[PDB]
Amino acid sequence: EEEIREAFRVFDKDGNGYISAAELRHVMTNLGEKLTDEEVDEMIREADIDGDGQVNYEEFVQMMTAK
C-alpha cells in the first residue's frame, strides 16, 4: 500500500490526488515505457471506471493490483 501510495504521489506532480493521462506519459516515457496517446487512452479507459478520463488512487490500485 505505501509503495502504491508513494508511487501514486510521485505521478501526481501537482498533488491534485489524480493522475492525468499526460502525467502517465511523463512517468511511462521516463520509466523507459514509450506509449502513444492512444495506448495511454487504452490504459486510462481500462483503469478509468468513472469515465472521468483520469486514474484516481482506487483505480490505480485495481489497475496495478488487479487480482
Q: Which residues of the chain form contacts with Ca ion (CB under 5 A)?
A: 12, 14, 16, 48, 50, 52, 56, 59
CB count within 10 Å of CB 64 equals 13
Asked if residue 41 belongs to a known ligand binding site, the reply is no
**Using CA atoms, how far apart are residues 12 and 38, in angstroms rounded to an integer?**
21
Q: Compute the least distance from the CB of residue 36 to Ca ion, in Å.
A: 20
Give whichever of 56 and 62 is closer to Ca ion, judged by the CB atom.
56
Is residue 58 within 8 A of residue 19, CB to CB? The reply is no
Q: Compute the least distance from the CB of residue 39 to Ca ion, in Å.
A: 18
